[PDB]
Amino acid sequence: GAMAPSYRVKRMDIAKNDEECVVNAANPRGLPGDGVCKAVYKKWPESFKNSATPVGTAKTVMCGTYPVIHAVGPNFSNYTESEGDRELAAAYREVAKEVTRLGVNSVAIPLLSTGVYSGGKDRLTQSLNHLFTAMDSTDADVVIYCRDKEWEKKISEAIQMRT
């Protein structure tokens, strides 16, 4: 565990993280995909061996000794708001299980279902609150990765609110 488990946010490519493992915003089929998933495919392509897993689950595949946790959020284009919310909560609970099992002191994590799976809605708060519900009971240092300057500010403010 970390000495003093913390949450932090950085605005940069999650493929350049400084943590002991990474969460991929995966598709259910283990395909290279777009956005975070394509950056992860370029950096750790060996981690996509038998990475296919259903919506609301996470599957870890090693790239050398570096763990890639493939977490499959719902695509809100296909799910109802209600069923989507349930699956998004479940994906983060499975990430917390994997992070615990691996015994890492730190993890790099994107906000699941906030990009092309958002169904065209702003889901910063929804996705971040499910991340907190899952990860609050773990002792890994969590570093959240985003691209948007305004999202960096809102994520930072939400972390600071609880401290």
Q: Tell me which residues touch ligand LRF (CB under 6 A).
A: 13-14, 35-36, 39, 110, 115, 145-147
Q: Which is nearer to ligand LRF, 10 or 97 (CB)?
A: 10
DSSP label at residue 80: -
CB of 125 to Cl ion, least distance (A): 13
Sheet bearing 141-146, strands edge to edge: 7-11, 141-146, 106-110, 22-25, 66-71, 58-63
Within residues 98-157, the interface with Cl ion by CB under 5 A covers 115, 117, 146-148, 151
Q: Which is nearer to ligand LRF, 36 or 142 (CB)?
A: 36
Structure tokens at 83: 């069923």
Confirm if 62 and 80 have CB atoms less than 8 A apart: no
Which residue ranges make up the site for Cl ion (CB under 5 A)?
12-13, 115, 117, 146-148, 151
Annotated binding-site positions for ADP-D-ribose: 13, 27, 35, 115-117
